[PDB]
Every structure is written in C-alpha cells, then in structure tokens.
Design a protein around this ligand. Structure first.
Ligand SMILES: [Fe+3]
Ligand SMILES: [Fe+3]
Ligand SMILES: [Fe+3]
Ligand SMILES: [Fe+3]
Ligand SMILES: [Fe+3]
Ligand SMILES: [Fe+3]
Ligand SMILES: [Fe+3]
Ligand SMILES: [Fe+3]
Ligand SMILES: [Fe+3]
Ligand SMILES: [Fe+3]
Ligand SMILES: [Fe+3]
Ligand SMILES: [Fe+3]
Ligand SMILES: [Fe+3]
Ligand SMILES: [Fe+3]
Ligand SMILES: [Fe+3]
Ligand SMILES: [Fe+3]
Ligand SMILES: [Fe+3]
Ligand SMILES: [Fe+3]
Ligand SMILES: [Fe+3]
Ligand SMILES: [Fe+3]
Ligand SMILES: [Fe+3]
Ligand SMILES: [Fe+3]
Lengths: 175, 175, 175, 175, 175, 175, 175, 175, 175, 175, 175
C-alpha cells in the first residue's frame, strides 16, 4: 500500500500542508456552525438585515471547508470532520453568546473573525515555501473572510472614527 | 421581559417541544458533519457515485437543522448550535471510521441512521399530544431520512434477500 | 440474508404498509396510463384546454407512483411495476372510452377518480395505526388527486347546482 | 342538479369543513391586504428591511387564500372572496394603524397574528374528525404563519428576555 | 414635522393626485379580489381556459395596486389598503355573482371593467394638469386593463357583429 | 464572380432545390401571417384556448421560413422575402375569413393546411433525388405541420367519426 | 349585434384610431418581412455583425405588429394581416434590393426607416386628440424604431460628420 | 458630410433636445458615481439594508445614462461621458460626505435627489414642444428617480409627520 | 468473449459503418481543433465578429465528434480519439495558416469545409444501404456543416456574384 | 474611536495598501466612464461588433472599481468615488476623442490601456511586501485588463506583424 | 510592423512566457482529446459513474487550453493548435489504452496526470520571475488538475493505505 501525494511534492511538505489545512478545516467547521448559531439567536430592530446577511457567509464557509478538506485528501492524507475532530484541533473556546441583540453578537463575531483571519494570514506565509497552490487556496478564502468582517464591523463603526465595543476580548460593550 | 410562545400553546408544552427539537437539532448537526466526513473519506471502484450521492443529503439535512432551530426560537426558547452544544446533547459516539471503502462507510452510516430514524420516530409519537405542527415538521424529515437509508442499504443488500454487514453494531463486515 | 425494514417498525406492520402501497402503486400506474389515453382520444371545441389540462396531472401521478414505490422498497419489500402486476392488483375494469368528446371522457374520468380517491381515503385511515409517514405520503397525494377531480367536475357542473352525467356508473350522459 | 362532494365524505362533514375554511379564507384575504397596507405605511431607520421582509409573506398568504378557496369548491360549496364577504365573516376590527414606525406596526401585526394563529390552531383540532386532508392543509399554513410571527417578534424581543409593547391589545408601547 | 412631497410639485396638486390615486388604489384592490372570486366560481365546458386566463390579470392588477400605492406615499400622503378603506372609497356594489357559468361571470366582469376603465380614463385627463408622471402611470395600466376587457368580450362577441348579454347593467343574458 | 454551391452538388440540382424551397419559403411566410391573422380575428366561448394555441405555431413556422431561406442562400441563390415575392410565388388566394367564430376559422385553416401539407409532401418526394439534406429539412417541418392540423381538426372532429364542415373547399359549415 | 368599443370613447374616435393603427399594422408587417429579407441577403466582411444585429429588431417589430393589432380588435374593429391587406394599405414600393453588400442594404433600410418613423411621428400627433393610450403605444414603438435607425446609420456615418449614400432616395452610393 | 437627425424633426429642435439630454447625461453619471460612493461609505446598525438598497439604483441610473446618451447620438449629435464633461456640465458641488452614518448620507442624498428630480421635471415640460419621445424617455426615469427618493426619505420620516434633518441645504441634522 | 452489435444488423455492415464513422470521427476532431486554431489567430477590423462566430461551431463540432464516436462503440467496435489516431486516419494536410487576417483564414477554412462536406456527402450515400440510423446521424451534421460554410463564404462573396479568393486550393487571394 | 484594520496587518502597511488602491479606484472609474464614452461615439462598417464588444468590459471594470473600493474600506480607510476625487487622483488627461471611426477610438484606447496596465503591474510588485491578498486582487484584474487590450489590438494588428497607428502617444494613424 | 506585448514586460520575458504556455497549450489539447478517448472506451460495472465523471474535466481542460492560448496571443506571439503542432511540442507517447475496464484506464490516466501536473508545477516556478499573471493562470489550473487526479486515484486507492497498480509506468495492474 504505497502512500501517495501530488506529483512534484515531497512527502515532507505534503504532510506539512496537510496538517495546516486540517487545522483550517476545523476552524471553518466551527465557524459555519457558530455563524449559523448567531443567525438564529439574534434580536433587535435590525434583526432581519443581519439575519439574512449571515446566510451567504455560512454557505460560503461551508464550501471553504469542503475545498480545504478535499485538498488534504488530494495531498494523500485523510481529512477529519466529525464533531470530535473539531473540538480536538480547536484551540479556543466555544462561542459563548446566546439569544442577544445584533450589536452584541456582531461584536462577539468580530473577535471570532480576528482569530480566524489572523491564523489564515499566518498559514499563507508558512505555506509559501511548501505549496503555492494550497497557499492560493487560502488567499482566496482570506479575501472573503476579511470582507465579511468589514460588514460586521461597519455595523459597529463609529460616526467617522471606528469600532464600538472596542478591543475588549470576550464582550465589553453595552453602549 | 415577558417570555413568549406560539398563540394557543401552553408554556408547559412549548418547553416540552423545545427540548425535543433541541436534541433533534444536535442530531442533525452531528449528522451533516459526519455525512460530509464520509463524503471525503471514501475509496473504491464505486467512489464517485457514492461521493456524489451524499452531497444532496448533506444539503438537505443542513436545512432540517435550520428548520428545526427556528422552530425552537419561534417556540420562545433559544436554539444551541455551537460544537459544544452538539457534544453535550449528543448521546452516542463520534463517527469512528476514516479513510475506507464505500462498503465500510455505508455499513457504518446505516447504523448511524438507525440511531437517528429511531429517535425521530419516537419524538413524533411524543409530540403528537404536544404540538401537531412540530410533529408535522419531523414527519416530513423522517420520510427523507428513511429514504436516504434505503439508498445506503440498497448498496449493501443481498442478491434477493437483504443487508450485508448484518446487524453488528460498530463494524463487522469484511465481506 | 437478514430481511430489513424501517428503524422502529415491526415487520408485522412493515408488510402491512407494504401491501397497501403496492395496491396504490398499481392504481397510479393504471391511472397515469389511462389519463394519458384520454389525453390523446379527446375531441370537441374545448379540445385544447382539456388536452393540456391533463398533462400536468399525468406528470404528477407518475411521480406519486415513483414515490410510493420507493417507499415500499424502503419498507424492505420489492415493488411491482410491470403491466402484469398492474392487471393483477387491479380490481376494476380497464378504461373503456376511446375517441370521444371531452364531455364524455371527463364524465368517465370523474368516475375513475371516485374509485381512486375513495380507496386512498380508506388506506389513509388504515395506515394511521401502522405508519404515520406512509400515511402522510398518501395524504399529500389525496389532496392533489381530489383537486384534479374538481377540475374535471367543474367542467360538468350545473349552472349553479351540480354535476351532469349524474351518478350513472359507466356512462349515461348524452346531454 | 345533484350536489357533489369528495368521494368518501359525508355531506354533513363536507359542509362542516366548507364553513371552517370559508372563515379561514376571509382571515387570509384580510391579512394579505393588511400586511400589504403596513408594507406601504412604515417609516424608520430600519424601513427597508421590514419593507421587503413583508412582501414574501403577502405572496405566501395570497396563495393560502387560493389553496383554501379551491378546497371549498372541491368540497362542493362556493367560495366567497369579494370585499363584502370579508367584512361579513370578519369578526374583528379593520387594522387601525397608518403611517408609523416599524416598531409600532410590528407590535400591531404581532397582535393580528395572535388572532389568526389561534383560530387556525383551533380549526386544525376541529377538522381532525372531519377531514384529515383539509386539516393537513391548514397545518402546513400554520407553520409558515407561526414562523412569520417570530420574525415580527424577534424585532420586538427583549435583550435576552422577550417582547416589548408587552401584552397590550391594541397598542401600548412608545418604548 | 415638515410635510414633504415631490420636488417641483405644489402641495396643492400633490394632495390632488394623492386623492385620485387613493380612489384608484381601492378600485384595484376590489378588482383583484373580485377577479380572484370569479376565478374560483366558474363552471362550464370552457372552465379551464377562463380559469387560467384570469390569474395573470389578478397578478397584474395586484402590482398596479402596489405601484399606485407607493406613488401616493411618495407624494407625501399615506395609502389606505385595509378592507374598510376599500368599502369606504368604493362607490359601487360588491360583485354579486357566485357559482355560475363562464358566460355569466364574463358578462358580469365586462360591466365591472366598464366601471374601472371609464374612471381611469377620466383620472388620466384630470391628472394631465396635475402630474404628468402619475398620469403616465395610469396610462400604462389603462392599456392593460382595456386589453383584458377585450379578452372577456371576445368570449361574448357575436358571429361577426358584437357582444352578447348586450348593454344590460347587472345581468340580462341567458342566451 | 464565380457562382458557388454546396460541395458535391451539381449546379443543375442546386438550382432545382433552390426553386423548390423558394416556393416553400413563400408558403410559410404567407402562413405565419395568416395564422397570426386568425389569431386576432377569433371569437367564441373557446376563444382563449385557440387564441393561445396558435402562437407557438406562428413562432414555429417563422423559424421554418428562416431555416428554408438560409438553405437557399447556402445553395448559392438569393432568397426572396418581401410581400411582393410572396404574392408572386403564391398560387392560391389570400385568406378570406375575418372576425368570426373559432369553428369557422379552424375549418378555413384546415383547408389552408391541406394546401401546405400536400405540396410539402410532394417536394419531399421530388427532392429525394436532388438533395437528401434539403429533403430532411422539409421532412422535419412536415411532421410539425401535420401535427398542428390535427390540433385544428380534433376541434372539428365528429363524436367518434370525423371532421365537421366536411370537404367543402372555401367554407360550408354553419353547423 | 351591438358594436362595441373602449369605455369612454366615441365610436367616432374609435374608428379613427382603428384606421390609423391598421395602416401602422401593415407598415410593421411589411417591415419585419423586409428586415428579415435583408437579413438573408447580405454579404461582406462585416456580414455576421449585421446579420445578427437585425434579428432582435425583426423580433421586436413582429411584437409591435401584434400589439397594434390587438389594440384595433380592442377598439371594436377587425385587424387585417394577410399578405393582401399589406399590399393594399401599403403606399410605397416593395423593398428592391437583393443579394448585396451590407453597406448597400443598410443605405436602403435607412430610407425605409425614414418612411416608417416619419409616418409614426405623424400618427402620434394626430392620435393625441383621439386616444392617449393608443398614442402612448406608438410613442413606445417610435423610440425603438428611431434607435434602430441610428444603428444602421452609425454604420454609414462619416468620419466625424455624417451619413454616406447621402439623401438619394432609392440607392446612390457605391462609395 | 450631411449632418443627420430623426425623421420628421427640425435640426433646430434636435439640437435643443440634444443639449437638454447632455445636461441630463452628466447628472446621471455624477449620480451613479455618488450613489456608489455613499454605498461604500456608510456605517451604522442599519448598514446592510441601506448598503444593498443602493445597488439596484446605481444599476438603474447607469442604464438611464446609457439610454439618454444613445438618444443624443440618434438625434445626430455626439454624447460626452468622460470625467471632464461631467464636471463641465455639472452646475452643483461634488458630493461632500464621506465615511458617516446612514442617517447622514441619506439626508445628504435626499437633497441631491431634490436637485435631480427638479431639473428633470423641468426638462420634461420644456421637451413637450420639442420631442414627445425624448419627453417620454425622461418621464419614465422621473418615476423611478422619484420613487427612490421616497425610499431614502421614508428612512428619515417623522413618527407620522415627516422628514428629519428638515430643509437644511448641505447638512443640519445630528438628531 | 462474444463480439456484439446492433440488433438486426449484420456484423458485415456493422464493421462497414464503424469504419466510415471512425474516418468521420477524425475529420471532426481535426476540424474542431483547427477551427479553434483560427479562432485565436485572426486579425483585422472585423476581428470580434468572426472571433465569436467560430466558437458555437467549435462547440457544435465537438459534440458531433462525440455523437459519432459513441455510435461506433454502440456498433461494437472501439473509437479512436488520441492525436495519433487523428494524423493516422487523416488524409490531408494540417491547417497551414497562422496569425493572419480574417479574409485569409476564412478563405482557408472554406476550402477545409469543402473537404469535410464532400466526404460526408459521400458517406451518407454509402451508408444508405448499410444503416439508415447512422446515415440519419450524418445527414443532421451535414446540414449544420453546410450552413456554417455559407457563413464563411458570405464573408467572401462578391457584390452580387460570388466568392473571392476563387477556387485556388491552398491560398490565392490577396484581394 | 479606535481606528481599525485587517487582523495581522500593520497600520503602516494598511495605509500603504489603502493609498495604492485608491489610485487604482480612480483609474477604474475613469476607465469605465471612458470605455462607455467610446461605446456611444463610434462609427464605421464594423460599428456593431465593437459597440457590443465594449459593454462586457464596462460591466467588468465597474465591478473591479467596486471590489477595490470595499477592500479599502475593509482596510480601515474611506474610499473616494465622486467625480472630483477622480480628477484629483487622476494623473493623465481626460479621453480626447469624440465621434470617430472604430479604428481611431481603438488606437486611442490601446494607449489608455497601456497606462492602466503598466501602473497596475507596478502596484502588484509594490503590494507584494505589503498585503498578498490585495496583490491577488489586482493580479486577477490585470489578466482581464490585459486580455481586453489584446481584443483592441487584434483589431489594429498588421497582416502577420503587428499594431497599426504604431507607438504614437495621442493619435497618429489615418491609415 | 512593430511587434507588441504586454505593457511593462520585456520582449525577452514575453517570448519566454510565450514558449512555456505553448508547450502547456499542447499538453492540454492532447489531454482533453485523450480524456475524451477514455470516456468512450471504458467498460465495467462502474461504467456510468466514470463515464460521466470525465466529461466535466474534458470541458474544463478545453477551456484551459483556450485561456492559455489567448494569453500567448496577448503576449504578442501566435498560438498553435492544429494536430501537428500537438505532436510536435508533445514529448511523450500517444495514449495507448483502448477498450478496457475503468480500473485500467484510470491507472493509465493517473500516470498521464503525473506527467501534466509535474510539468505545470515546474512552469509555475519558472514563470515566477517572468510574469506573475501567467503564473497565476497556471496555478488556477494546477489546483483543478490536481483535484481531478485525486478523483481518479481515490478509485484505485487501497483499503486505508493507497494506490493500486502501484508506480508501474505504462500499465502493470491486473489486480
Ligand atoms: Fe458544500
Ligand atoms: Fe465536496
Ligand atoms: Fe441552511
Ligand atoms: Fe435560516
Ligand atoms: Fe418519475
Ligand atoms: Fe425514482
Ligand atoms: Fe395566487
Ligand atoms: Fe388559483
Ligand atoms: Fe405586489
Ligand atoms: Fe411593494
Ligand atoms: Fe426567426
Ligand atoms: Fe436567421
Ligand atoms: Fe408575436
Ligand atoms: Fe398576440
Ligand atoms: Fe449600461
Ligand atoms: Fe449601450
Ligand atoms: Fe462533448
Ligand atoms: Fe459523451
Ligand atoms: Fe457594481
Ligand atoms: Fe458593492
Ligand atoms: Fe472553449
Ligand atoms: Fe476563446
């Protein structure tokens, strides 16, 4: 049973890209479940616009999870997508907010995205010497992830300055 | 802050339907992640047909999770969809198979579906005296869930008799 | 070769639902062939409207036959759909009208539908204690079957009263 | 002119289902006109999201009115849909709000829906012994009606508790 | 609270166009309900063609009601669309026909359209000096309204001459 | 200026196919104008069904005219499609019926089609030795032309026998 | 057999609009046949772009002919669309060009359009006192007719000045 | 190089319509750029609904600019659409707001629309004696422009009265 | 391993049709590659129209290659589609033109088509006694192939006569 | 009011990418207006093909302007899109050609594109050390921009050599 | 005849990218013909799934060939796509398998893909210093090419290990 991988790629690197994506795979799965969670637990006068704004993102992220997963399998390894594998690779805490105003959930998500976008950014740099294709993959995602954050922030942005519920990891904005 | 619910429904029952669906909500979320997991980890000569056969089901189940969740929220409670809430309400073990033949994964899934279809069946009967609408909801699902199992089984069915990897909870069919 | 069935269903009932649907399966197959038959053998000034009115129904019924059939297979049994199995389970006489006015064919069909709708109605009641899902299945059909009859009747309806070619099993309306 | 009805249904029950739906028919017609009325008479910063949120519902309800009406006609009776028949069967008061904030109109609608959902709920129970199909019909509606209310409420919901403009029949919430 | 209106329009005229449309708004609402009413209460050999011919018109008119209504709101006033406002602005009698032949209902509708088309024609002339845009609006409608009448008439037209159930306000044609 | 034609075709035959199609081209142009003419000048209780039944045919024939025309041009000659060229190649009389019942117009058209279908049939046989492709072209048309006639006839067909307004060239059926 | 017309229109004017449109009806029919004629008889290096540019126009004009025709019928009269009625109402000469360069045909068409656009312009002014709706109808057309001419001219336009094959009724431009 | 224009239009008027539209052309171009500008520079809790509400308008206006431009070219003149031609024909000041709340931008836009709708209104009246078609063109636009303003205003409208940031040219509403 | 073929066809003929199509298969493959080649290597003022005109043809031919190939396989033999099999069955020279004016490439293609259309024409006649279905297949193609040539020629056609770069196998037209 | 930016990006670089894109934003806006300008001011025998060839590009560029703009906003800054901001950031001269042959406008555009493609190329290199995502963004554009230029050039290309109106900044090609 | 190229690219590099792509162009053309070849020559129980799995890939590759080709032309050179140019640039042997099991063909293709993916990988690295855009182009392809291989391999993969018909260039797997 000769283990395989992409033509012109060292098993060393293959396993290196494989591990990076697998961590990414779980970030996404956690995220499209979370996103969906805040989708149902939002309340406020601007309920509908944010309620609907989230769905396309959930759809988009689910695809990313799928893209990234099959890339691992193409790399030669086996992708892990059961609830356990998520909690396992997961390095942060399970989304804590529940029924609550849009303003709250948004502020919470903003932070969540800070986590995702910062790690992806890193993986892109790391991947550069490992596999340009897998790097291209994440670059594509990054742009869409970063754009969605701005939609969230723009909702919290200050009159002409910026963000409310300012840099306070894990809540901190009743204003 | 007066708690609400459906017009013509006793808070007693509301909370009763709410709890039933919340358990259902997690079964689905676990299932559409699992389904997706076996989607990427299948191998064999009949790889493509099963690879693709699974996707519509994943799409369908994700919707069910969504339907059921908003029903809870309409009931007055708050739906839980983060990875933790899954493992919490979850009463069985995280899908165990990984890269492996279609035949294996199918046999594994069959069993998984046995779990889901049997609990839904129960909830339907229970719900009958609680809320006909929520019961109708699950009835709809049940039919599609039951139908998908048959697709899986039909792949394991015997010449003219029935199922291979016969009633052996957690694997037991190298034939 | 261990025979299978739906999780949480007694082989006793499974075979009971199975038989009911199989009789239904043949009623449909007979019906979408008949419907199609009258579709080609109609004449009159209102030819086109009835000619086209029938097609959607033929399409709809064919699907019902398909739904019901796979339900049997999901139940564990084997569905029968060859011309013989039809004549076998069939308990009435093969549509007798041929080239003839819309008014005639409609009156003939009305009666045919009386047969189908009355038996389905029965099976629904019977199924109630056997399998709620299979019952739901037929309920869905029933509504569409009953609605189509009204389209047919509305064509025979009296000025403000009702039906022409009044209750006369097997023709009886040259008016 | 022999009066007709559904095969396997007692004229007694037919006329019983017929009357129930006819009352339902007018509730809908009143509702999709009202819904449309508040659609044009809304103002506020969250104008657009609610403006558009209402349309699908108006479209959906209009269909329900249509479904229910043809069911009556299939039952053998004659459906009434002119403005007079509405006011006649109508048992409550004509929507009273006019140009006004979303928050107001929503609170007003919430109450309106309380009326509709409570009566439909009743008719479902009543219909159970009369005609399962007609009951299935309304069950379907109910779920969509109940879901739309939640969209409205979610806009009035409290931080983590519930509804503003709390239980005050006919206005009572400037907060 | 400074009342507004269209740039370059005298509040005098604004309120003048506003009133004209509001009367139009109710004519439409009455009409798309009526149209729908005759849609369900038709019988005859040519049932289906007329049954279906009506729907597009109902859809079209509902839109007109919507167009006209938002024009009022754009004018600065508040549009009225509840069942009461209809009966209020309404100057004629609630459609009187019920279950009955196509020929009858058509003849009845013809007359109804005579009412609508004659008043719209008038409003167009009146509006000419008030607001060309609002006039353009109704002109558009008029053409479609007038065209639909011809479909109705063409059904009643004489061999090569014209209309049956000739000029007899409120029925008068058993031929 | 070397005249061209299809590779492997004798200029003798080319000009022979060319002439046949050019006569066909005018038959079509005359026909899709006529068809359209009777489309606007029909009256009766079954007005709508026949009104609409004609349009697809007009669309279809217009295409045939287009197909046939470019075939001529591909043959090397120049197709003629102005009103004059029609009257020129035309060998029969300009459709004579005007505003009149469906029954009349249909009977008139039936005859018109008898003309078209009989000449096309001939051209097919003639073309067989000239150019199989051009023959295939007309065969295709023929089937659709012949089918449309049956729609027309089926409207005039006798109880179980056949056609009314029986073989009477240029009218002859007030029954 | 009481002759009919549009509600609120004097038979005097009806017959006046009727005649104007009937002349228009033939102009269109002549035009969409002609347009089609030049569509097949064009040659040159820019063959394809003009070949295809013409089709949408033919489709558009055919519709105009249809619109205008049913307007006549709605007016109470009977529209004439057979090849004879064309030549009859026709006041100019049958398109004379045959196989020939785009440049030629375009120049020829330009002139043809000059005829159509100038007469329509007139009818619009005339109609103003007769029927605003029928006037609106032609105004709509005019814009599309005028726009298509510009496409044709733009092909003949001078470096920065204007039109080639300058004002020379019936050919006159080998340059 | 003989200058051209629309058949039946005096070069005097042509150049008159031409100039009017050219000013309109620049108003639009300025507007769909501005609209787009505020589309990106909005912030607030109701960010998404207004963010998206603007796009259809930008798309619509861009088309208007296109329609109007080709009308000029059809008139015989040459349309100007480069950034310079805008600033040139432009008679007001370049949109001044930048990153800022929806409420602000809306109030700013309202005023902008007041400018556009008032000038278009004028041009319509002026054009009436010049070219009915070009007048029809702008009438069409006007209705859509006026309607969009109402969407903007409805967001600023008072409880039951009207507009906030009341008549204060160039800002004046922190409330 | 019993060799198969179409029911009711002599292995003698099967192998005869098989060989004919296989030669056709390579002609197509060569052609849709060539067509594509000239698609990229065209230059001139009429570049775009011809650039795009070619694509549909490439798409169409590729399908023909596919149709024809599976027909061989259905015949019992094995279709050959690798670059070698092309050059093998190929009896002419590899397209020689490269970057060059439309006029050139067209003239070159014209000749290429002369080759294809003449051989197909032959195969049709030959096939007539072998297999009517396979003959029908090629007849269909032929018509589309012949039509495309005319598009090419029409670009080279003379003022009113015909083709430029007249009958000069392998170039010969700088005019 | 804490200023924000992308997670894992130094405010130093953010403002650096921001400025680069803002210059790009104006290049695009200038370009899709210009492109549109030449779209209306083209004349010649190949008018239509180039007229239409331009539209997709205008649509594409407008999107790029939108993409790039929201990227700035996501970066933390504020995008500028009013006519003034264009002229401001603009470093070249406003498109100078007006009504004129395709050949001219194309040659003019070619040069315009030389400007855009050369600056984008630069920004890509510069961005490489600043933000890979924003670099990816422009790379995507570049390919489409570069491809469109080739369409333009291919129209000016020499027999087998290259470009006409050879390297002559600001016109220089009457040939 | 001044030779051209992309703005901001040295003719040195242009010709360097040009040559790389031209080799790529032929690899693709060879591949989408081959792919298609194995598409028709497959047999087995899993025939259909692989039969259909291949088509999307053939469609995708054909596009790549098209993309890459126009990139060359945009670079200034001339793309070569005739069967000869393929065999010329081709450095390996023409696909050797013919009618044969899926398992065989897949194993054969796997190897073919090893060739393509390894060379593309190389060209990407090489191109990095030549033209980032052309590099981006191939990166995109690579990902899709690599993904398709995995579909092929997954069919040959071992129970939990990997690939059958293990590393044996040119067949070697009857197991
Ligand atoms: Fe997915
Ligand atoms: Fe997938
Ligand atoms: Fe979902
Ligand atoms: Fe949802
Ligand atoms: Fe089916
Ligand atoms: Fe099926
Ligand atoms: Fe409806
Ligand atoms: Fe209906
Ligand atoms: Fe509507
Ligand atoms: Fe609306
Ligand atoms: Fe056509
Ligand atoms: Fe054509
Ligand atoms: Fe038409
Ligand atoms: Fe029509
Ligand atoms: Fe546009
Ligand atoms: Fe345009
Ligand atoms: Fe294909
Ligand atoms: Fe195929
Ligand atoms: Fe855009
Ligand atoms: Fe945008
Ligand atoms: Fe392609
Ligand atoms: Fe291409």
């Amino acid at each position: 049973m000769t283990s395989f991988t992409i033509p012109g790629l060292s098993d060393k690197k293959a396993s290196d890209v494989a591990d990076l994506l697998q961590k990414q795979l779980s970030t996404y799965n956690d995220l499209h479940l979370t996103l969906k969670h805040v989708h149902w637990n939002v309340v406020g006068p601007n309920f509908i616009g944010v309620h609907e704004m989230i769905d396309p993102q959930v759809e988009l992220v689910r695809g990313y999870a799928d893209e990234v997963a099959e890339r691992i399998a193409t790399l030669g390894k086996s992708p892990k997508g059961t609830p356990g594998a998520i909690i396992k690779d997961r390095t942060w805490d399970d989304y804590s907010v529940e029924r609550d105003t849009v303003q709250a959930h948004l502020a919470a998500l903003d932070l969540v995205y800070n986590g995702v976008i910062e790690d992806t950014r890193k993986s892109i740099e790391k991947l550069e010497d490992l596999d340009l294709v897998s790097q291209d993959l994440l670059i594509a995602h990054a742009g869409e992830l970063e754009k969605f954050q701005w939609f969230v922030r723009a909702h919290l942005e200050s009159a002409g300055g910026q963000l409310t519920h300012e840099g306070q990891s894990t809540e901190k904005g009743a204003a």
